[PDB]
């Protein structure tokens, strides 16, 4: 029943998922005046060279590019993390226009979209098991700013027409997620949650300071999928972002000043 509209959107989620008003919810606003530089924060290791993509799925609230996580292939290590986390999928959040779309904000600035690369801790058995743990997941968050095109995104935006209908998927092998990464791995980090129901508080967030540039042409293509439903004249998938939640009793640490 949950979604992003007036009657089932983010301000309604707490009824089905009370944890929506919990102590470690995401996203948040990253205020650069109060994020704390932490010299003990290690550089992030993003080792995606062996990535094996499988398919792309419209799950009714985003499109997910899913990966073979049956063995160590594309993994996240280092940074604030205690071990190895396997990439299982990435997806985006975006707006109904370019001025909004991101879930995290920086000094209240909204970006046109936000990329989430979702990884689970190989200390646990699988993704299902990991989301039940406070250190189960690591999500690498990357802002999308409109400008020059990101060439590594083109394969993704080109295939979206094939999965406009909720639930549909398409084969999506040999996509390399290294083509979605900015130059710098400077990051903010804090303990948080999934930003969609069930909103489980199982995520170490790592949000990159540097956005990637994508073109207006590219982000337009995100806006062609539908939210679950079919017709006769139903609803396109835009503004699938949760607004910033209160930081509460947490601290956002930065790997940089
Ligand atoms: Zn997300």
Boundaries of every domain in the chain? 1-257
CA–CA separation, 172 and 132 (whole Å): 29
What is the Å distance from ligand 1's center to 256 Cα?
24
What is the Å distance from ligand 1's center to 231 Cα?
26
Q: Give me the resolution in angstroms, 1 decimal.
A: 1.6
* 138: DSSP letter: E
Q: Binding-site residues for Zn(2+), please?
A: 91, 93, 116
Q: Binding-site residues, please?
A: 91, 93, 116, 195-196
**What technique determined this structure?**
X-ray
3-state helix vs strand vs coil in the chain, percent to 5 = 15, 30, 55
Q: Which residues are catalytic?
A: 61
Helix, strand, or coil (residue 35): coil
Q: DSSP string spanning 101-125?
A: --SSEETTBPPSEEEEEEEEETTSS
Name the CATH superfamily housing domain 1-257: Alpha carbonic anhydrase (3.10.200.10)
What is the Å distance from ligand 1's center to 147 Cα?
22
The owner of tokens 């949760």 is: 242
């Amino acid at each position: 029943h949950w979604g992003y509209g007036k009657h089932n959107g983010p301000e309604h989620w707490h009824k089905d998922f009370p944890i929506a008003k919990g102590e470690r919810q995401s996203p948040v606003d990253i205020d650069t005046h109060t994020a704390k530089y932490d010299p003990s924060l290690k550089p992030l290791s993003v080792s995606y060279d062996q990535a094996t993509s499988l398919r792309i799925l419209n799950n009714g609230h985003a499109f997910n590019v899913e990966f073979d996580d049956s063995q160590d292939k594309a993994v996240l290590k280092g940074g604030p993390l205690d071990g190895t986390y396997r990439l299982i999928q990435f997806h985006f959040h975006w707006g109904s226009l370019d001025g909004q779309g991101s879930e995290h904000t920086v000094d209240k600035k909204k970006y046109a979209a936000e990329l989430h690369l979702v990884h689970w801790n190989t200390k646990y058995g699988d993704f299902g098991k990991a989301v039940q743990q406070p250190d189960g997941l690591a999500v690498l968050g990357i802002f999308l700013k409109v400008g020059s095109a990101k060439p590594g995104l083109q394969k993704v935006v080109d295939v979206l027409d094939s999965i406009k209908t909720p639930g549909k998927s398409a084969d999506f092998t040999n996509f390399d997620p290294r083509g979605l990464l900015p130059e710098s791995l400077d990051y903010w980090t804090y303990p948080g949650s999934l930003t969609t129901p069930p909103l489980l508080e199982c995520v170490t967030w790592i949000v990159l300071k540097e956005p990637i540039s994508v073109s207006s042409e590219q982000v337009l293509k995100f806006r062609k999928l539908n939210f679950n439903g079919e017709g006769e004249p139903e609803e396109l998938m835009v503004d699938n972002w949760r607004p910033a939640q209160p930081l509460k009793n947490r601290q956002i640490k930065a790997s940089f000043k």
